[PDB]
Structure 1
């Protein structure tokens, strides 16, 4: 009884350039399935026209994964001269109790390392400063270094918020509601990797493994701009 995101033309292009992974890294719906009206409790269109992702369980996900229209997986040079841009209008509801962090957008390499995660966190402590109920950028310091550089981007609001990730040469920038919140962070540690975008709900370290993480996107796209 769920309405498909594909019924809104604002999502046709990104769905054509995506596959849906749920509840783990297995594909449940390819582009052609998504465009044919794929809909489920973990992926549906709300009555006010948000694409809503919902999932429970530790490290479980409902997430779109960037694809080419050819059906090739996206695998662009992480540090190449072509700009890669992901834009989304995201409403982050107040999360259920037991939900501690939800990744909503990613730049991921083609193996096992996330270049960037944008995530809601109940709390984070950075260089001695604790922030609560914020949106966070996490950039991994390298494939062989589990540590990351963390940057608070925004105080959590339920209001629809514009996020832009711009990746070009060895630099990554994030804008939030038109304001640069991460200005040309270095990602040269991913020279020689290939990369793709992800977007949705990716549930990190819940304290209640049955609670549902939930994330709503009013717009979503990922594009290239050739230099």
Structure 2
């Protein structure tokens, strides 16, 4: 059998506060199933150390969704409760196979929409500038579909080695750190003031592939979801 992610200690904290959605938003595995050896080609322990997600097909996913810890239900939090909600990861994004065009690897999402997607992107122009094989943030500052509802930023070019991300939400401000460097510094999330259904996600959410059979693949060496408070 493939080795289960829960067979080592590294990911137990996040698995204790997550459900897995695969191959769609429908539930694949409860937190307890994840902690108790849930495994498949879509979600297994890779190289003895990575929590690896794999998925093919347009808008399909293999993605963790933040839950209340210790067998609780779906969590919802606000962007301005005075604490800092933090997601920290270390991700090896391999070269993506032909046909994979965008893979969302971390999110802040709510009942209505994604406040934030961090995604690998094969190629895109942002603000008149071309980028290739890179990591992008897409922040929603509204619920519409016109471009003024989004702020998109080049976070980093993809590296062969592990790349760390820290997503901090405090007092309606979003900070994204990559490999220890602040890239997005206090992006305003005030549009979401009043929303109490936000949560973190992470894994592989396959967006707009050119082939339905091409398999997105993303490896986490570390993932934690925490609330920092006094």
Scaled to the shorter chain, the TM-score interval is over 0.9
Aligned length: 226
Deviation (angstroms), 1:123: 1.0
Structure 2: stretches of 5+ with no match in the other structure: none
Q: Aligned to 2:198, what secondary structure does the other structure show?
A: strand
**Residue aligning to 1:201:** 204
Q: Which residue is 1:157 aligned to?
A: 159
**Aligned partners of 2:34 and 2:119: how far apart in 1?**
25
**Which residue of structure 1 lines up, in the alignment, with residue 125 of structure 2?**
125
Match of 1:107 in 2: 108
- Normalising by structure 1, we get a TM-score of 0.97
Q: Which deviations, in whole Å up to 9, do the C-alpha atoms of 1:111-170 show, x marking residues without a partner?
A: 230000000001111111111111000001212355311000101112111100000111
Alignment of 1:160-175 (within 5 A): 160-175=162-177
Structure 2 CA distance for partners of 1:72 and 1:146, relative to 1, 3 Å: farther
| Contact residue 140 and residue 146 of structure 1 kept, 8 A | no
* Cα distance, 1:56 vs structure 2: 0.3
Distance (Å, rounded) in 1 between the aligned partners of 2:145 and 2:115: 12
DSSP 3-state at the match of 1:192: coil
Alignment of 1:130-145 (within 5 A): 130-145=130-145
1:14 equivalent to 2:17? Answer: no
The answer (yes or no) to whether the contact 1:103–1:203 under 8 Å persists in 2 is yes
Could you state the TM-score of these two structures normalised by the residue count of structure 2? 0.95
C-alpha displacement at 1:30, in angstroms?
0.5
Give the structure 1 partner of residue 229 of structure 2: 226
Q: 2:79–2:173: 8 Å Cα contact kept in structure 1?
A: no
Q: Matched residues in 2 for 1:167 and 1:63: separation?
A: 21
Q: Deviations over 1:180-205 (max 9, x none)?
A: 01000001111111200000000000
Query: Which consecutive unaligned segments of at least 5 residues does structure 1 have?
Result: none
Change (3 A) 1:146 1:9: farther
Distance in 2 separating the partners of 1:127 and 1:221: 32
Partner of 1:65: 65
**C-alpha RMSD over aligned residues:** 1.1
| Aligned residue number for residue 54 of structure 2 | 54
> Matched residues in 1 for 2:80 and 2:27: separation?
27
Question: Which residue is 2:32 aligned to?
Answer: 32
Shift of 1:104: 0.4
* Whole-Å separation in 1 of the counterparts to 2:28 and 2:126: 37
Conserved in 1, the CA contact under 8 Å of 2:117 and 2:139? Answer: yes
Runs (4+) of structure 1 exceeding 4 A deviation are none
> What is the CA distance between 1:173 and its match in structure 2?
0.2
1:198-220 CA distance string (max 9 Å, x none):
00000000001110000000010
Matched, 1:213 2:216: yes
Distance 2:187 2:4 in 1: 37
